[PDB]
A paper describes a structure:
During ubiquitination, the 76-amino acid protein [name] (Ub) is attached via its C terminus to, most commonly, Lys residues on substrate proteins. Ub has seven internal Lys residues and an N-terminal amino group, all of which can be ubiquitinated, leading to the formation of polyUb chains. For the remaining four chain types, linked via K6, K27, [name], and [name], very little is known, and proteins generating and recognizing these chains in eukaryotic cells are still elusive. We found that the human HECT E3 ligases UBE3C and AREL1 assemble K48/[name]- and K11/[name]-linked Ub chains, respectively, and can be used in combination with DUBs to generate [name]- and [name]-linked chains for biochemical and structural analyses.
To understand the underlying molecular basis for the [name]/[name] specificity of [name] [name], we crystallized the complex with [name]-diUb and determined a structure to 3.4 Å resolution. High solvent content (67%, Matthews coefficient ∼ 3.8) led to high-contrast maps and allowed building of a complete model with good statistics. It was immediately apparent that the arrangement of Ub molecules in the crystal lattice generated seemingly infinite helical polymers. The asymmetric unit contains five Ub molecules and five NZF domains. A distal Ub interacts with the Ub helix of a proximal Ub, forming hydrogen bonds between Gln49 (distal Ub) and Gln31 (proximal Ub) and charged interactions between Arg42 and Arg72 (distal Ub) and Asp32 (proximal Ub). This exposes the hydrophobic Ile44 and Ile36 patches of each Ub molecule and enables binding of one NZF domain to each Ile44 patch along the filament. Consistent with other linkage-specific NZF domains, [name] of [name] forms a bidentate interaction across the distal and proximal Ub moieties. [name] [name] binds the distal Ub at the Ile44 patch via the canonical NZF interaction involving Thr14, Tyr15, and Met26. The proximal Ub is bound by [name] [name] in an unusual way, at a binding site involving the start of the Ub α helix and two nearby loop regions. In this interaction, Ub Glu24 makes key interactions with a complementary pocket on [name] formed by Tyr15, Asn17, Trp18, and Thr25. In addition, the solvent-exposed [name] [name] Trp18 side chain forms apolar contacts with the Asp52-Gly53 loop of the proximal Ub, and [name] Ser20 forms a hydrogen bond with the Gly53 carbonyl group.
Numbering used by the authors:
A (entry chain A): 1 to 76
B (entry chain H): 6 to 33
């Protein structure tokens, strides 16, 4: 399946993901296209932050769903 | 009665004047 990740600027990127993929894998998929380290990025779905441990199937992410991407660089 | 931010979906606590996630401001 494919899902859509929506940045804060309003830009939308599409990702070829399988339900068995972990959130960790998703942030790596984002890293492939955007070039940002998976630890400086965080994903939001259903008003909650997604943890790298669980998979999409655990979070009920389905085909053509929308995730929100927020970036925060380490301030020390 | 958690409020959701305008710029990201994240629902925050009523006491928070700013979202914890994208550091946006409280909506009018
Ligand atoms: Zn926000």
């Amino acid at each position: 399946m494919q899902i859509f990740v929506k940045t804060l600027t309003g830009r939308t990127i599409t990702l070829e993901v399988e339900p068995s993929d972990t959130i960790e894998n998703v942030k790596a998929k984002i890293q492939d296209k955007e070039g940002i380290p998976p630890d400086q990025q965080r994903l939001i779905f259903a008003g909650k932050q997604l943890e790298d441990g669980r998979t999409l199937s655990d979070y009920n992410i389905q085909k053509e769903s929308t995730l929100h991407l927020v970036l925060r660089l380490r301030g020390g | 009665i958690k409020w959701a931010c305008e710029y990201c979906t994240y629902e925050n606590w009523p006491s928070a004047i700013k979202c914890t996630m994208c550091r946006a401001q409280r909506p009018s």
